[PDB]
Predict the structure of Flagellar hook protein FlgE.
Amino acid sequence: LDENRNLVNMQGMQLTGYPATGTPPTIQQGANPAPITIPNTLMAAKSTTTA
Amino acid sequence: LDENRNLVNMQGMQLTGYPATGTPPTIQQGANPAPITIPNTLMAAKSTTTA
Amino acid sequence: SFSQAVSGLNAAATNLDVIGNNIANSATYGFKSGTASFADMFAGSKVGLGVKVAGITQDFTDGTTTNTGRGLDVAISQNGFFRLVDSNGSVFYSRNGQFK
Amino acid sequence: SFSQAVSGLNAAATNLDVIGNNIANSATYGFKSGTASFADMFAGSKVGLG
Amino acid sequence: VKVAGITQDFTDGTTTNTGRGLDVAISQNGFFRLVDSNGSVFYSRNGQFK
Amino acid sequence: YSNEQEQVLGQIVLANFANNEGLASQGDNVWAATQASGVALLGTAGSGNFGKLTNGALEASNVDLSKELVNMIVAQRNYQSNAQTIKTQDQILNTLVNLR
Amino acid sequence: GKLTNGALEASNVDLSKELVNMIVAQRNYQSNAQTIKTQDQILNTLVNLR
Amino acid sequence: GKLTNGALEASNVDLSKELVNMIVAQRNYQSNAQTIKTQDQILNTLVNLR
Amino acid sequence: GATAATFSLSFLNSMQQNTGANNIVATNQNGYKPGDLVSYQINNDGTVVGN
Amino acid sequence: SMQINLNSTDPVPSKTPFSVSDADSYNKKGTVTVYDSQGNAHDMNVYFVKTKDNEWAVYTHDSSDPAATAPTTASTTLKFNENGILESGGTVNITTGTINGATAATFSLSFLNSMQQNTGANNIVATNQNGYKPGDLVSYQINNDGTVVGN
């Protein structure tokens, strides 16, 4: 996990794959392959809708 | 197995032989020698006739 | 030919030096594992000529901790590093907590 | 004659370079085996040269 | 029967890892631009510079 | 996550080609495709042509020792046969010089 | 996280895999040595070619 | 920087690459020797031309 | 929304035990669902067999 | 061209009405990256909703242009037979959008030989377009036919 939020090798090349989008994000089957990120950003403050 | 569905050598020449035709296909003895293919196509959706 | 031979020879020698230096700091306090990586070479036409070393690869797995007599020798259990300073004010880091 | 001699000589040298390069990446991670192939030459009248 | 002249070949060669970092060979097609005392432009793939 | 949460951050894709031998080395173990290699047969692991990988494990070389040294002996002896052949050729041409 | 109060962390050195690598890289070095031995014998015959 | 208090720095000599250069330059010397041998045989025939 | 399929069903060689327990010996149908080319092998006859 | 293998054992999507952000409103979403005379990569989301047995409303949505509204109309409707053979609804001309002052490009789109699996999972077989972007001479080779092939 490099400083640019991506899993890079010793050569610095980022491994790609399927991204997840939404709230909550799920892996979609019809996306472009994207460099997989591990963001340290804050989560979505979601209130209670269905209980 | 090349991009043209045939078993080709380093010289690219396709090896020939007896083809199989039908549903289910069996090797017939009275055919022209044909370049043997390994197709990745979908199988025949066969319903139950005799059980 | 001889380029691949000297490349593999120096790679084996440097890897054995890395292994012997890892043996040389066996049972020292505050040690994290370090190994060596491998590399290959680009194809001329489609050949490929040489096998090399990508560099030093340090590993930071958790190690063995011994209870000590003092209280002023505090190792770091989780991810964290002690901030040290030299005479010139430069910032350094060390998990070793032996301080007097 | 000497054409077949230099052909076999350079083929043996290049094959040994391939073998030595395969030895040079022994025990590296992610390695797949690679070897060399052979070829012959077309017959002049019915001879074959190389 | 004569000689048509010198024929230079520019195939890729053998590269050795060196101790310095200021000796950088050229891997792909490319040439280093050098200048003399008279400002003329020259080229060299050798990257040993101090 | 600290709030007992788990969210997927991505999923790595996989591919196969029509010809595995049609690859091109780009230095280290890095493969650029060719026209003879095949189109990107995309897909995910554990489905069809793809299977479950080695989680936390790295695959070393497929190098055997015995057959490599066997080829090292046999091609050396073939080189010796070529050397003695060209030796006999050069002695023949020496006699052709000594013909005059 | 909470640290090791009054405790010092030694090396993470395992013994077995280190000696395994010590054996395996030694044998790879022996393969390189015998390889260069065969290379030098080939070049000895190339000298003995003339 | 801070020096080696009570410590003396020995040579930076590696063994393997030195012996490699000792082999390779020896073989280049053998190539030069066989080259000049062929040159002297050519000049011997030039003497034997007359 | 499928079609009601009619199939021939044979109980051939179904035997009556003099004593024991009612046990189905075997079942077989020629109906299936695709199905795609996973791999391929060749036996000792030159026949390219699809898996 | 877009070939896709589709499971027949799937039920009708219950989430009504259709939304491009409602994955449960359809069963499968495709995506094809095409290019225009300005060379912008228009990524068409191709949604497939099972209306009934063998009939699938097929929607197109230029996802690369954010000014496009939610498509509630059918671009086509793939209708098939009992065996699952490609019967109707597999060809439509689709107009793209305008990105950075481009032109809205209309292209012929064929779903030729898209098969209906009797069972399995909805999987796109292949996608292909004749649109691209330059592109320059990197290298050159010649095969065994004397044809100088440009790379």
Chain A has no helices and four strands.
